[PDB]
Amino acid sequence: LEALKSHIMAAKAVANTMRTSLGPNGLDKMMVDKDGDVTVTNDGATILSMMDVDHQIAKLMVELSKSQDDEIGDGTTGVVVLAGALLEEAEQLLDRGIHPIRIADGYEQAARVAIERLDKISDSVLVDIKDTEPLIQTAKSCHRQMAEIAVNAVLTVADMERRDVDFELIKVEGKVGGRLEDTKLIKGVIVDKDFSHPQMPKKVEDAKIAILTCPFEPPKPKTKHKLDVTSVEDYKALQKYEKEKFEEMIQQIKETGANLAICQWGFDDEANHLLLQNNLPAVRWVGGPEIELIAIATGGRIVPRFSELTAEKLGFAGLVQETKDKMLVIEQCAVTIFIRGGNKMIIEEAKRSLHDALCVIRNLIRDNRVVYGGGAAEISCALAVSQEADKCPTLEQYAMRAFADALEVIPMALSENSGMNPIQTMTEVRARQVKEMNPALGIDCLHKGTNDMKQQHVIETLIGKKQQISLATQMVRMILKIDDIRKP
Amino acid sequence: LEALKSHIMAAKAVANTMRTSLGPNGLDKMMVDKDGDVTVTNDGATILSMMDVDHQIAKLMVELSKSQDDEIGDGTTGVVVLAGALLEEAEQLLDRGIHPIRIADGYEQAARVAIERLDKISDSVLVDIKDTEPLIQTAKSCHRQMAEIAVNAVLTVADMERRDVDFELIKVEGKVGGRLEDTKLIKGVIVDKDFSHPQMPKKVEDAKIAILTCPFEPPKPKTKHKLDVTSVEDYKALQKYEKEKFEEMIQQIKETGANLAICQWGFDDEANHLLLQNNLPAVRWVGGPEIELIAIATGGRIVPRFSELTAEKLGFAGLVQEISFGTTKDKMLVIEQCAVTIFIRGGNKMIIEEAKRSLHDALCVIRNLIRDNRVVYGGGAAEISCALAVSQEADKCPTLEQYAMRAFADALEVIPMALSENSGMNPIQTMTEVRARQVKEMNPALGIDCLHKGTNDMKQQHVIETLIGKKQQISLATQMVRMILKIDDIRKP
Amino acid sequence: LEALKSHIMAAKAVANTMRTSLGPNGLDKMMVDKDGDVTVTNDGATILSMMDVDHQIAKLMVELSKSQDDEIGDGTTGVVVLAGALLEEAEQLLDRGIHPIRIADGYEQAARVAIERLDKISDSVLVDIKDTEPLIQTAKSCHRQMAEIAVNAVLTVADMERRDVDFELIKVEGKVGGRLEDTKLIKGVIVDKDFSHPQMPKKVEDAKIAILTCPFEPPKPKTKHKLDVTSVEDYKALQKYEKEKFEEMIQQIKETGANLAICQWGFDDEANHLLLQNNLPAVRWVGGPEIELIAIATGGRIVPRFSELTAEKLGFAGLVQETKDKMLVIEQCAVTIFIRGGNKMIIEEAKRSLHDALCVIRNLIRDNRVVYGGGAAEISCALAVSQEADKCPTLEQYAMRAFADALEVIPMALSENSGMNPIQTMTEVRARQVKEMNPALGIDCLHKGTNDMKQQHVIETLIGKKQQISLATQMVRMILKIDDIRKP
Amino acid sequence: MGLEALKSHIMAAKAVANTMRTSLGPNGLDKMMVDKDGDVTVTNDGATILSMMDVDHQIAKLMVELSKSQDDEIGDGTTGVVVLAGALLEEAEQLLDRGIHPIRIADGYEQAARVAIERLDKISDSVLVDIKDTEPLIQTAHRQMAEIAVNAVLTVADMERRDVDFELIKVTKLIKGVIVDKDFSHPQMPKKVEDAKIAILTCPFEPPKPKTKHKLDVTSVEDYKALQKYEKEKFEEMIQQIKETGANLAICQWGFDDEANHLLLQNNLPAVRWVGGPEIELIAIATGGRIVPRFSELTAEKLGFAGLVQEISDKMLVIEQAVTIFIHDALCVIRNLIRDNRVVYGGGAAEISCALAVSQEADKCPTLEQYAMRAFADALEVIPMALSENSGMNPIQTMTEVRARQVKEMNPALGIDCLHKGTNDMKQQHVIETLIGKKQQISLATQMVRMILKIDDIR
Ligand SMILES: Nc1ncnc2c1ncn2[C@@H]1O[C@H](COP(=O)(O)OP(=O)(O)O)[C@@H](O)[C@H]1O
Ligand SMILES: Nc1ncnc2c1ncn2[C@@H]1O[C@H](COP(=O)(O)OP(=O)(O)O)[C@@H](O)[C@H]1O
Ligand SMILES: Nc1ncnc2c1ncn2[C@@H]1O[C@H](COP(=O)(O)OP(=O)(O)O)[C@@H](O)[C@H]1O
Ligand SMILES: Nc1ncnc2c1ncn2[C@@H]1O[C@H](COP(=O)(O)OP(=O)(O)O)[C@@H](O)[C@H]1O
Ligand SMILES: [Mg+2]
Ligand SMILES: [Mg+2]
Ligand SMILES: [Mg+2]
């Protein structure tokens, strides 16, 4: 049986590692690590992205933590903290003599209760005309225009009518240099890597693009091959040969519309020369990522060849201009935002913040409902779970109450990270929720305010919490049922 | 003799490992493998499929567990648990002074008794109209459409008139991403991979398929060559040659009907080039399986050549498509000459692999029912009544087989006991009370809830294990115990 | 002197290993072993076939155990058990002060006595019209038709007139799948490996076969060789060359009669193509074993060439047909039986049983005499040996009595394997043989019957026992004389 | 430890049971058994074995005195008690592993014991009393032994009724009372002490040394001879004290020696010396006589009324206020027959019929006690098996065939020959275990197993 307690202990370790980074006052960690740079961040989603590999059960949790929440929802730290708490209680319930399967079934019952109780606390947010602008400022002073950019980005490209699914279709590329919120919103894709030769004309109008992934030397189907190159004459004949078929690539592209092209893999030495004369010149190269962006945005049917391009495909951009990066306007349609800043730390922080923003909006587009955070929704869920537990017989009663006390960890953790007395403030808030009948208040947490939390606008959406609880109960289910730990 | 006790101890060790995974409340076993991912499942069939292969007796239990039950029936974990119990009892019989061959004889006779008793407990199930669907709910809250697609799958592909033996020509593919209720109704066979090339036609309709196991390169003498190209003109002569002989095979396929082709082995550098320019979207590349699927489904008469074919061979498919799931892509085709294949999108990566085994249980169950339509009620009930009959026959038998029969009777009762402990109930208390409620109520159905919700009657909850599942379970268990009870010295050079 | 006791001990070890697998209730062992499959069987003949190599003297026994009995007779387990017993007695006789050479000479005397006494117990079995059918059912419910198949197989192909020697000429090939005794008897050879291409016509009538072992590329007598393949023209000229000489193999075969051929070694890629057009197509390949079967059955003079075939040889089969194996009928003459079953364990068990059958019949054809088994013949032999020992003086007296007590191990072992008290039942049977004067009864052994053993039809033939005793005394002779154990 | 200490006690006790499992029945093994500087003692009958051996585990010592203080002091058969206890524990192990609580197993063993005990009433066979029959009934334990034992226990018995007595017997001739060795010391004394008042004194005979700084100093004749004379007079004090309360002979431990024994002759006080507990408490329980810790301070009262005391070449006393044999086994058996005159046939037969009863009654039982009773049946069946293997027969074979012949022939008698010569009927050979022997055996074994089952932790 102690195999279960080994799993429960190793998982509680991960939880205690992560519960210090919960909330706005969370901590950062270090991570590095492949002789490379460092990353200091809250938001456990990127914390789990590294996390040295040790115990098998811990990695079961690391896989399932990203599995749904980080990939679809937002809140990741909460999943692992809640899971660890549920395990902390399942320990003292296992000691009391209850069988694990009974613990898991009880946690299922309680989970369904809390989820069914998040709908009663829910609040609605409408779409299609701003109003989500003030809903984003919560996701992070500098928020007012960032919200504008976010909504304007997601609403322009979204299924929305109807289906209620986004695309993305959207990444972000920041330039070190500028000042904070001088960031700009665009309508089309933007890439780095310039024209490959300085003498090219900037500004290519109504451009017909040529997306190709091929090398530039004509190959031969593989035979024993070798060569002879006997007389110097044949040497010059060979040079002349591929020098001819370098043009066979140039005007062949120009027959289907030229302007500028786009190449992957290699771009030869004198190729840029022969391409400069014909006003074709492309770019090299940045593969798949940033290639498929231009593929979906304009045209484009990426061509793996090598002389087989016929249009048909490609097109149709209207502007391509600039000190090292080239950016393009007027597309066939596709948005990829742009960010200013300085010191390299003013950017990449706003990228994390933005990520939070886009995620929130997408979730609202799918289902537009919100519950109020700061542990308030957790507390009320615990009230309902405990209430249903008082009316339930047999052993699942105790497992349900354990679920309640486990949910009450989020207010406690939020309190610890801000320096408040955990159980004291947590208890006071639970009391103030029973009376007042206000499932909105709890954990300031910013040390400034009236604690109402309906103010301060702290929203955790709705699918975010239902996915957090569902994933947590799913994990704890596995960990409770895992034994033997085979492995070769 | 102690070699036998070593075998009995190791075998009971395997059994004790998997007696916690018995029933719906069974446990998981982490089970990582090689340099790859992990797999956590109940249903010992996969457990035995990997496990830790060490002792030759454990190897024997894997050998025979997959030999018959996993390949034909369904229940595997029960076989190893029952064999373990029979061994645990036969050990004390060894100590009692009984010869092993006599214990195996008694176990054989008792096994025949129980087997013959399952027929008396049997019940009938109708066929051909919506009657098996509600009885698939035992194999697994997504059941409502799972059972539906199950019966549809096995009834669409079956001998059925009559002979009542059919399997395979049906596979399952999970593409990972969605929720379990996103599972869809199915039509024809569906495979992965791609036609290659992005400029390919992504939807080829009314396709005549050409299935080939051949390389696409023009062959060479394979004598000892030193091919040395002299003049640059001969460089171009080489390129021209293979550029032409790659095409000599293209319109060779197009003269017998083209659309799209199908290739094993290599699809060369240019090749796909020359096939795009000639508008022949072939595909590459897949081994025996998934080749013979499209072979039997449409057409197809797999061609071992290589420029030699007349069609004839090509099949008649109505639609072939390429759909992109997330980033990666799989090409799936509909409207075949007929052959159906199921599809699952579960999400979370672990929500699938559950639906695959749970569905497999469905195909197996329905297949067994078509072969012989009879059911005994599960939850250990059939085991309890079988133990009752075995003890009854044992009280009236003299000499040494008497003791072996009683040991068999007590060994059957481990299934209700394991089912009891895995659900949190007192193992011997509930099992005993049920064994009394089966003689007093004369109802060979009730016993071990086991879901901790219900009337314990087991007539409701409709838990069915068919018949050949149980008959093969007991036959395989007694076969294992028979072999293990013999065998000494374990040479192992 | 203790070198002798080391040999005697190491040999007694092998004996004790084997005496549990004696009789119908014998045990199985495991064997495996080269990262391969397992084999669980009675009949020590296949047990000695593996048996890890340890002591030199043990391997002297393993070589001599197969030397004659398994290769010609049947009973192998009895040889090693009897040898071990003779050694067990030779130990206590060596301690008594008798020289080994005297022990061996006494064992010779006693062996000659017992052998000379097996003729008095002998019984005759006639040949040429069934009657051997009920003689086979003893060799293993399912026996009635198997006996039919066995006699019908051996009598059709045997010298028999006269010479009294078989051939074999006969193997067995079973197909997993079927039901038990649905096995069939044929008149001709049968092989696997199909026609090598599906488009061939099944059923090749009055076929003229072409048995060849050669590769298909024309070689050159070895010189420094190399090549040049300069111009593409010469490349195509080379391809054309061997493409021509591939036909030079085809119609060359068709000139001497074609139908189907048979090839060993490799069969090239496009060779099956060029052979499909000309209605020649052969098979690849399964070497010597199953090749020489068709050689002796039809024709065939296996040709190692490579263009030198002229007929003369080859011929003359009448049918070749079928889901993976091809079988042929109507030959020039040659029998190889066929077996149904299921689970892979229903077959290969009947193969072992069959092996026993064929061996018995062959032995009867050589010399048609039988003694009754179950240890009865052993007991009576012990009675005669002890009787001659009471009238013999000097030291060989004790060695002879030791031979008697050593023969009496077979009834004891047979008793142990069935669970009876060894010395009690053995003694009772010896008594019941002295009175009643019936050298037929002893050791049930099936726990069901009247113990008469003239019933139950338990026959061990005659050469089987005389060879068992001769081989046993031969072994014990060596082991008794071996000393020094040189070795590099 | 908490629980595994239970399995440890099972192992430790069944170790003892397996030690003495070979010494059961007539073909038992003798066990060398020396003792320190002592000699060899080779016998069956574990009764004397349990006295020896060693204190290994406190449960192994708990096996003793439960198998001794009762069955050796009440019944006769000791080895069966420990063998049975070991078997019961062995099956209780399988019941423990099955998930059954220990106290439930102990209770089940109690109820099963009730079934078996109450049977023995049904298997029983009565024997007549008051003459003969008992004599030919003793040849089991060569002719006169029956007679002398019969009349010896006949002379000392309650008989009307309650039927109990022991211990007035110990150790070929007949006997008139209890007898002692040694002499009255100094044969000039009278050998005819008839109508003797015995003065039982376990004490020294010395001048009462005062308590003060002592160190005597003496100079030859004057003081020395006065010292000898002094303690001789002080000896006459005790002499004249014993004659004032009572008369004639006395009995003394410790020292006499010196002249001393001379003086008592001149005063006609033929005492005896010297012996410890035995032969002191023997004549104490026989005649009179209590015990005096003094040393001249007593009232009588105490003295015994022995009628005759004589000396023959060992002095013996007759007619006591008690008869003892002169040259074990049947003497206890007869006592049991005096208590209850019924017998059941032995050789494991009573165990087999009891097992058939406990199992027949166990088939109809709810809850867990079912398995406990069945285990009890399989426990009683170890006596026929052990009996079988000790003679060389196949254990389970002979045992099973007999258990079948008992229900088919309806004969709670036949089973285990065992001497390899007989008709197996057990009616002949006249092998009888009485009733109190078996009933006490089962009660004691079950008491043991229950005790061990309750115990846990225990240091
Ligand atoms: N202004 C705020 N006041 C109180 N709590 C907050 C506030 N903003 C965020 N939180 C809390 O922080 C918790 C976790 O968010 P975060 O630390 O970003 O990690 P994750 O989003 O991965 O859980 C949420 O449960 C939320 O209640
Ligand atoms: N709803 C149920 N109630 C009671 N027992 C069940 C139920 N479903 C399955 N079982 C039991 O589970 C046992 C084994 O099934 P499982 O644990 O899936 O492995 P396997 O099928 O390989 O033996 C069966 O003997 C059956 O009696
Ligand atoms: N039906 C039978 N009853 C009694 N003994 C038998 C019977 N069949 C075979 N045997 C005995 O089995 C012995 C050995 O046969 P087997 O175990 O096959 O090994 P091997 O033939 O190599 O000695 C023979 O000596 C024979 O007496
Ligand atoms: N003649 C006999 N035949 C069969 N069994 C006997 C015979 N005499 C004694 N026994 C058995 O021996 C058993 C034990 O006696 P024993 O070994 O002397 O030691 P104890 O009497 O102390 O147990 C008794 O249970 C009795 O049944
Ligand atoms: Mg957050
Ligand atoms: Mg299952
Ligand atoms: Mg044989």
Numbering used by the authors:
A (entry chain B), C (entry chain B): 31 to 170, 180 to 361, 367 to 377, 382 to 536
B (entry chain A): 31 to 170, 180 to 377, 382 to 536
D (entry chain D): 29 to 169, 182 to 211, 222 to 363, 369 to 376, 382 to 387, 403 to 534
The authors write:
TRiC interacts with approximately 10% of the entire proteome and its function is absolutely essential for viability of the cell. The general subunit architecture of the CCTs subunits comprise three distinct domains: an equatorial domain that includes the nucleotide-binding site, an apical domain involved in substrate binding, and an intermediate domain that connects the equatorial and apical domains via two hinge regions. The CCT5 homo-oligomeric complex has the two back-to-back rings of eight subunits similar to the full human TRiC complex. Moreover, the human CCT5 homo-oligomeric complex is able to hydrolyze ATP and refold misfolded protein substrates.
A mutation in human CCT5 subunit at position 147 that replaces a histidine with an arginine residue has been implicated in hereditary sensory neuropathy, which is a class of disorder marked by degeneration of the nerve fibers in the sensory periphery neurons. Sergeeva and collaborators showed the CCT5-H147R mutant has reduced folding activity compared to CCT5-WT against human γD-crystallin and actin substrates. However, biochemical analysis of CCT5-H147R showed that it was still able to hydrolyze ATP and also refold protein substrates. The human CCT5 and CCT5-H147R subunits were solved at 3.5 Å and 3.6 Å resolution, respectively. Our crystal structure of the CCT5-H147R mutant shows the same double homo-octameric ring arrangement as CCT5-WT indicating that the mutation does not affect the oligomeric assembly capability of the homo-octameric ring of the CCT5-H147R subunit. The structure also shows that the Arg147 residue is not positioned in a way that would disrupt the inter-ring or intra-ring interfaces, therefore it is unlikely that the mutation would impair the oligomeric assembly of the full TRiC complex containing the CCT5-H147R subunit. In addition, the CCT5-H147R structure was solved in complex with the nucleotide ADP showing the mutant still can bind nucleotide like the wild-type CCT5. The electron density map for CCT5-H147R demonstrates clear density for the side chain of Arg147, and shows that it is positioned to make a hydrogen bond between the NE atom of Arg147 located on helix-5 and the main carbonyl group of Ser428 located at helix-13 of the equatorial domain. Changes in contacts between structural elements in the complex could have an impact on the flexibility within the equatorial domain, thus modulating the function of a particular subunit. Since TRiC is a highly allosteric molecular machine, the CCT5-H147R point mutation could have an impact on the function of the entire complex by changing cooperativity within the complex.
